[PDB]
Amino acid sequence: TEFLKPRLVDIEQVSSTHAKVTLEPLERGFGHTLGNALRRILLSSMPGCAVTEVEIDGVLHEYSTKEGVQEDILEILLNLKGLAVRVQGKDEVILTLNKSGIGPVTAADITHDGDVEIVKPQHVICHLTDENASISMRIKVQRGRGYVPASTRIPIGRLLVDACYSPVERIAYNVEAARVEQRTDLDKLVIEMETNGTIDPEEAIRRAATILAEQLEAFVDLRDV
């Protein structure tokens, strides 16, 4: 009759990039059910901090090329799209990257304002070939959800980049048996995930529980005709 409730019995940070977690106890059938549900939601709609706008002083339009930088402006923008950031209090913020001289250019050179936190300083944006050629650029990043391209939301120097509001890429789940526990058929659910590192596993799974519940609140809210 009863249905024993699971608990987040384990969180483990296997790598600095990602983690795995465990739910226990679960009973027959609920395993794959909650597995697909959680995987679908944890892949579908999460918070995000994808870069939104990029300004560069020497750039009129995107498809030009700056002197002293080997790669195209578009390639630089794609590298920026490969960036990941963490912010706590503010919905939006402006980041400032200023640097000249020969050598690589990674996120480590960006201004390190408090809530703004780089998760991948080693992420290279570009390389510079000139001792005196300063890339000096402002980066508006705000929160969001899902995927917002430029054509949707749509200054001449302000160049627009599509949004990629997603901190995770890979998710999988496995059911298995638990200890005897004086009761067999108890199901342990192990959830494995891969993230850039911008989201804690507990935060993500708790938000998944909350969102799926309020969706079920509609099922609770079923009224009249």
């Binding site: 995987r39 892949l43 579908s44 890979r170 789940y173």
Partner: protein
């Protein structure tokens, strides 16, 4: 007759949408039905869709 001619170059970044056409290396013609969520797609045991 002409006194001056002016040309202008417009860039458009077209990504993808339903109805576009693509194929491989076997004559395997194919238009694209519907861009669809990662979550509707099938995935292996390790989860990669």
């Amino acid at each position: 007759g002409v006194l001056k001619i002016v040309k202008v170059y417009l860039a458009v970044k077209r990504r993808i949408q339903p109805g576009d056409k693509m194929a491989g290396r076997h004559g395997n013609k194919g238009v694209i039905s519907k861009i669809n969520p990662i979550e509707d797609m099938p995935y292996d045991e390790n989860g990669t869709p």
